[PDB]
Amino acid sequence: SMSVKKPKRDDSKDLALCSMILTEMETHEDAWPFLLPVNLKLVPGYKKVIKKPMDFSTIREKLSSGQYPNLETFALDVRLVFDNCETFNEDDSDIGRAGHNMRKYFEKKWTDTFKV
Numbered sequence: 001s002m003s004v005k006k007p008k009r010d011d012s013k014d015l016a017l018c019s020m021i022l023t024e025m026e027t028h029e030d031a032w033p034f035l036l037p038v039n040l041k042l043v044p045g046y047k048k049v050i051k052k053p054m055d056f057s058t059i060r061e062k063l064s065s066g067q068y069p070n071l072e073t074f075a076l077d078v079r080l081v082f083d084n085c086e087t088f089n090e091d092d093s094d095i096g097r098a099g100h101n102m103r104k105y106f107e108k109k110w111t112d113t114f115k116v
């Protein structure tokens with residue numbers, strides 16, 4: 001609270017570490033359904049069903065233009081990608097399973113990197 005300072009973790013490396021993690025996401029072989037925004041003109045249902053679309057290229061742009069205040073807002077957008085995927089796709093589908101694989105892949109890197 002006011003004039004009661006709390007110990008803060010060092011966040012000076014966060015931008016660089018998130019960029020590194022995002023690069024590893026982008027180059028994963030199962031990253032293909034998530035590299036670009038879903039085409040709202042070709043994909044039936046998506047625009048009405050998915051209230052907040054998100055993809056790796058949009059995250060990359062936001063990260064490169066200072067639109068993430070902190071690393072937690074970065075993680076929210078990444079998880080948003082796989083939450084949207086689960087909403088729209090069957091688990092038994094190629095995109096559905098790709099989503100599950102990428103989520104697991106992200107979370108281990110998140111823990112290994114920041115859960116010091």
Ligand SMILES: CCOC(=O)c1cn(C)c(=O)cc1Cl
Nearest residue numbers: 032033034038043085088095
């Ligand atoms: C490159 C193929 O991507 C898609 O068209 C697509 C991706 N996701 C993550 C979806 O949920 C639905 C589609 Cl149609």
